[PDB]
Design a protein around this nucleic acid. Structure first.
Ligand SMILES: CC[C@H]1OC(=O)[C@H](C)[C@@H](O[C@H]2C[C@@](C)(OC)[C@@H](O)[C@H](C)O2)[C@H](C)[C@@H](O[C@@H]2O[C@H](C)C[C@H](N(C)C)[C@H]2O)[C@](C)(O)C[C@@H](C)C(=O)[C@H](C)[C@@H](O)[C@]1(C)O
Lengths: 50, 7, 96, 64, 79
RNA sequence: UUUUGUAUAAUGGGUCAGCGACUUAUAUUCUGUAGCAAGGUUAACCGAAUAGGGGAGCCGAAGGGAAACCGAGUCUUAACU
RNA sequence: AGGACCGAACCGACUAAUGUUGAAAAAUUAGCGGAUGACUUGUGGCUGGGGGUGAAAGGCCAAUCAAACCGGGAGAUAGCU
RNA sequence: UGUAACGGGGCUAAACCAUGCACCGAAGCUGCGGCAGCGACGCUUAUGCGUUGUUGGGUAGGGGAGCGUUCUGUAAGCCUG
RNA sequence: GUUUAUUAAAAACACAGCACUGUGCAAACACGAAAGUGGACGUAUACGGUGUGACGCCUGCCCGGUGCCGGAAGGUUAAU
RNA sequence: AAUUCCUUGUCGGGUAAGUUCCGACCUGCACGAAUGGCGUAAUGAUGGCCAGGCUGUCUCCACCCGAGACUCAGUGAAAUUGAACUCGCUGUGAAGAUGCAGUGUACCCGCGGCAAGACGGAAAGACCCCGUGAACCUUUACUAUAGCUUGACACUGAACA
RNA sequence: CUUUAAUGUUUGAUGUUCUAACGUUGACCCGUAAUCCGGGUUGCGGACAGUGUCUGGUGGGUAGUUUGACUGGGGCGGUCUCCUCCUAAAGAGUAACGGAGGAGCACGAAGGUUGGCUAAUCCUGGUCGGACAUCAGGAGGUUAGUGCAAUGGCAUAAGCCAGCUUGACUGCGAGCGUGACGGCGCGAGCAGGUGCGAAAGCAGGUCAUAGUGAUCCGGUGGUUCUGAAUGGAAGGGCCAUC
């Protein structure tokens, strides 16, 4: 049912990425939020969100 | 048895 | 392995192998050896000749597996922190 | 003739020191994004085959 | 017509009780569907996400009752 | 014999005699027993042929890790209370 | 003249009884059909097994046929008795 | 199918209620003798005695100990016209 | 007329007659790795296949489906 | 109706009486035109119905002649069979008893007769289901495949447009 | 050192012509008194036809196979995993083709924190206004609400509203619960970094219990861990994910 899976890439150049889902249909603006990147061990902005 | 019977 | 038609343990669980192949040609040496090397020089092979390694081997550590007495010089091998200490403390010498 | 190791099992267990066997957890190969980090986290480190399955594994790996 | 069906086991219920060994952090009382049939208290609290009541430090389990009209409260008496 | 259960009206046998069904080989593990012991044992083969020789090799004395590697530790992690 | 008529030989096999450890692994007796025809018969030939042959029934292919018989794979396999 | 709804005879108590004392009755309990396993205690320990307490139904099945048959040695022995 | 030799002789099969369809001959078609042979020492008034079944009076509507015949356009499409 | 379930439909005929039959109706559960429709002389060991004759088919069986059955002599089978000292009844019971309980009855043994019982004999059910059974048959089941068919390259060349 | 165009080429498509591969189950000749074959001459056909390899189509003509289980016989029907109540006998657990209902999600706020707030229903009064809109007081005291079934919870609210936010964080995990097992669940605390709060604090998703899929094969990103002489690379492993 509708809600699709998204990747969340670290804005640091590291390849790290969290993973989750969102409603592609109702909220098209690309989700971003501060999350902990563990290869640099700093809280950093994560972009990509459909 | 057969068959003849039855049945 | 068959456990009724149920998916068997050795199939429910994932594979995780990867075989070193380099490991296959590395031996490990106990302190208890070397005294039996015959010639006070414990060499790249030599151990090999004392039948404590096996021809194909190309690498070897010396490992604190206890008990070395006769002073011995080990050459071309690797040797643990504890083994070096035991060798040296028995009048031994560890040249690369 | 020599027994043949049940080759599939050979690629999923390794005899340990005291004679145990250790394996990789299931449930960690795909459809992951929906699983708690805590759960997935606990599924990384290998674990011992239970007492109940020992019988099976050994019969699969006579030359373990 | 079209009946059958049922949830599984699920368990739920006191698992430690009274004076109990109550080691370090036992899940003494798992009747979730709770924060209610039982309540966090003394040297035990936690009260996990599925309302499980569990030891927070070693000792004996208790079971009391208090002043917001009744209410049960499980707690751990240091031994 | 088979069965929850058989005098069963459920199976099998007319009777006697002879024959008639858990073996053999090779692997592996456990118990007993024997040898020796941090060592134990040789395979083919030689052979004065059950001896003697042959230690190629196999098992064990070190483990941990997918692995490099490290080693009475090691793996996990930047790091472990 | 006639796959014409009545009717023996000859060829068939509609009914009945008998027979059913038979006289006979399909007959005997009394009746019955065809009887110059797509008739009937002696001898010899050809067609072979997923193949033959079949005015067609799955009929027949040596008392065997929804895949002949003999030998082989062979101690097929049998979670059944 | 034939009395066929105390098992029968038969019963007016040989039926029913209460109280009580008898007795019959089992491979249960006890007594006498005996075997075997496990205990302990005493005689006495390459043990076996004596007590003594106790245990000994049994299918699938697990464990233990044995009889006898064929054949090799022991055996050019031993038995045997 | 034929048939289930041995529980079915019939309304079943066959039949002459009818129709469709294939086949131009080195025929279609069948047996056959192939050579070859049958079809036939025949040739469309012939031959194979299929359905129907003497004769009499007749055989209506539907080509959307499936099949077959025809279709030098275009769309999609194999090795290469 | 070789098609009609309802159905012995309804009407007419034949019979003392007719679920069949003959003739009709049409409400054709669910005829129909070459997997031919409706007719049809003749033919049929073809199906259904009727009548005359005929009769032991029947009422209802009698007698007779022959072949067995029975007796003697000779020869001499068969299937089946745990073992038999192998009764009735009512009851019990792996639930339909010669064999258990209770009870009744019954001297021992043939021969000729009869089939109610020995869940009689005979074939390790075919129907019923079951087996991760078999085989043949079907198809727009699956995967292949002979055949048919398509193009490319080879055998395979030259011209001119 | 050309498109609006054309002479020499190496090269496809189509159409005519030729003979010389190839066909000839036309004729004649010889082997040869021979309807086989071969050679020969010749007519016909002719780079077609046919055949080999490759290839798309068709292919019950032929072959091998599959065609589930439960089940108050079997078939037909229904059912097959997950959550909730009862049956269930006051710990857990507990069957039937027993009785009733849900699920295969939703939410970047519907999550975190901080501050604040408190319902249903009825009586009385009140323009349009009624049995039931909004206001007022009073009863009542959660009979309301909860993102969805049912149960158990919830006022310190888990219910209602708002500000700031990303803790729906990475590595770990004393100790527990629950499973034959694979597995699933709960968890204080430690380390790093973060949010809200004056602060004590709280936060490792949501009031909780459904919202799901083993392994294999493979994709992607990362990763000096491996790299079949050596350096690389392929491939593999590991971490993340499909
Ligand atoms: C002539 C000679 C043959 O007799 C007949 O054919 C009679 C006339 C059969 O009945 C015929 C006629 C008839 C009506 O059976 C009476 C018919 O139903 C059966 C199928 O075949 C018999 C009896 C059949 O039995 C019956 O088979 C049935 C499956 C079950 C029945 N039983 C339950 C009692 C059983 O007795 C059956 C199988 O032939 C008996 C088996 C052992 C045989 O094969 C034997 C060798 C017979 O062929 C035979 C005696 O030689």
């Amino acid at each position: 049912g509708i809600r699709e899976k998204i990747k969340l890439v670290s804005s640091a150049g590291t390849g790290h990425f969290y993973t989750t889902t969102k409603n592609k249909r109702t909220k098209p603006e690309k989700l971003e939020l501060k999350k902990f990147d563990p290869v640099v061990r700093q809280h950093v902005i994560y972009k990509e969100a459909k | 048895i057969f068959s003849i019977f039855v049945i | 392995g068959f456990e009724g038609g149920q998916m068997p343990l050795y199939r429910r669980l994932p594979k995780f192998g990867f075989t070193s192949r380099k490991a296959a040609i590395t031996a490990e040496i106990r302190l208890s050896d070397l005294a039996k090397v015959e010639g006070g020089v414990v060499d790249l092979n030599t151990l090999k000749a004392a039948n404590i390694i096996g021809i194909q081997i190309e690498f070897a550590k010396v490992i604190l597996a206890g008990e070395v007495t006769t002073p011995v010089t080990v050459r071309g091998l690797r040797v643990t922190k504890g083994a070096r200490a035991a060798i040296e403390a028995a009048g031994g010498k560890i040249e690369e | 003739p020599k027994i043949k190791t049940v080759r599939g099992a050979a690629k999923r267990f390794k005899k340990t020191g005291k004679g145990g066997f250790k394996h990789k957890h299931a449930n960690l190969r795909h459809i992951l994004t929906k699983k708690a980090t805590k759960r997935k986290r606990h599924l990384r480190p290998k674990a011992m085959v239970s007492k109940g399955d020992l019988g099976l594994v050994i019969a699969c790996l006579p030359y373990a | 017509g079209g009946s059958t069906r049922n949830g599984r086991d699920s368990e739920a219920k006191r698992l430690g009780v009274k004076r109990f060994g109550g080691e370090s952090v036992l899940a003494g009382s798992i009747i979730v569907r709770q924060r209610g049939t039982k309540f966090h208290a003394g040297a035990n609290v936690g009260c996990g996400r599925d309302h499980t009541l569990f030891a927070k430090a070693d000792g004996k389990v208790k079971f009391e009752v208090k002043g917001p009209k009744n209410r049960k409260f499980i707690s751990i008496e240091a031994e």
